[PDB]
Design an enzyme around this catalytic site. Sequence first.
Site, PDB file in Angstrom:
ATOM      1  N   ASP A  31      37.224  34.505  38.977  1.00 56.79           N
ATOM      2  CA  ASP A  31      37.886  34.473  37.684  1.00 56.79           C
ATOM      3  C   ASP A  31      37.623  35.834  37.064  1.00 56.79           C
ATOM      4  OD1 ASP A  31      35.194  34.013  36.701  1.00 56.79           O
ATOM      5  OD2 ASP A  31      35.583  31.842  36.529  1.00 56.79           O
ATOM      6  N   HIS A  84      32.787  36.486  39.695  1.00 58.18           N
ATOM      7  CA  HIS A  84      33.033  36.243  38.268  1.00 58.18           C
ATOM      8  C   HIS A  84      33.051  37.591  37.556  1.00 58.18           C
ATOM      9  CE1 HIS A  84      32.810  31.954  38.634  1.00 58.18           C
ATOM     10  NE2 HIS A  84      31.639  32.006  39.267  1.00 58.18           N
ATOM     11  N   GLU A  99      22.908  30.964  44.904  1.00 60.00           N
ATOM     12  CA  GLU A  99      22.184  31.718  43.861  1.00 60.00           C
ATOM     13  C   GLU A  99      20.700  31.873  44.175  1.00 60.00           C
ATOM     14  OE1 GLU A  99      23.411  30.295  39.987  1.00 60.00           O
ATOM     15  OE2 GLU A  99      25.545  30.648  40.506  1.00 60.00           O
ATOM     16  N   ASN A 102      25.808  31.662  49.109  1.00 63.54           N
ATOM     17  CA  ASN A 102      26.779  32.025  48.039  1.00 63.54           C
ATOM     18  C   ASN A 102      26.028  32.667  46.905  1.00 63.54           C
ATOM     19  OD1 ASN A 102      29.593  31.726  47.064  1.00 63.54           O
ATOM     20  ND2 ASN A 102      28.711  30.276  45.576  1.00 63.54           N
ATOM     21  N   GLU A 158      34.589  32.033  43.896  1.00 67.20           N
ATOM     22  CA  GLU A 158      34.671  31.478  42.558  1.00 67.20           C
ATOM     23  C   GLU A 158      35.368  32.475  41.606  1.00 67.20           C
ATOM     24  OE1 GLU A 158      30.881  30.075  41.157  1.00 67.20           O
ATOM     25  OE2 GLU A 158      30.371  29.253  43.155  1.00 67.20           O
TER      26      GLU A 158
END
Length: 303
Positions: free
Chosen positions: A239, A209, A131, A172, A237
């Site tokens: 979802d 995400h 991030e 990432n 990650e």
Amino acid sequence: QAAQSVDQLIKARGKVYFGVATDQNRLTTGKNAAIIQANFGQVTPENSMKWDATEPSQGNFNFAGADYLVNWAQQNGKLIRGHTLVWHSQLPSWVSSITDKNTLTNVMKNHITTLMTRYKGKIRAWDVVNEAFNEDGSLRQTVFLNVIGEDYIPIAFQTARAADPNAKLYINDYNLDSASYPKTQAIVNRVKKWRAAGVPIDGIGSQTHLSAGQGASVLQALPLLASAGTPEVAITELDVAGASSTDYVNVVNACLNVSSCVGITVWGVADPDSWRASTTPLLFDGNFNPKPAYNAIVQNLQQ
């Protein structure tokens, strides 16, 4: 446990893994361990390798939860992505209060080297820096940027490479799901420049995400991320709010389409355990049964 494993099926298409976030707290309750054993080939510690968990006081490391995960993964044949060495969230105040460059550089390097040496050779990939970008594509003004400066990213990656040359080193980030998008364009540009300067960045991780209907965009964004020239990219990650099969199948197909995409990690097992549980965004429901999107991924991957 679902009868058919999305990890076996993606491996049969030439990918490295289909995995999930987990940790001791999940593995030791409910049906998580059995599901992971049966259906997934890789694990990311959801929390146990973050800075707050591992170095809660300076120089007083706590590896019990991370050790549990690594040992469980080895016992059960699961690859590991270490997560995450340099990040502003879940960062102790002893770190974020430092205002001296040398002090913080030495703290950061010691944190990286200590974690990576402990697990040397066991870790497929590390999220070295997480991030680092703002939504406008500028670098996020975290304590590391503010106190170390621009060099913090080169330093982190060089330190990581020295500590475990076997691990794939990733940067990432999230909101890398559109090819259009200042953060996406920026990470590609900056990774190209860092690598041209000799920084050892092996991977771009795209957290993925998503909101409902957004998966289609990954079909264009992931090849753009791959154009930065790293040996790997990965969906790290995943979802999806609502867990539509259409969104999940689109992300899987994006990875299939991009040869440097090594695999996919979904961010947990069962919906109530998601960080965004109210959106029921995972592939297993609260009764630990596979959801329609799990079955849709299985079928998409069948040959």
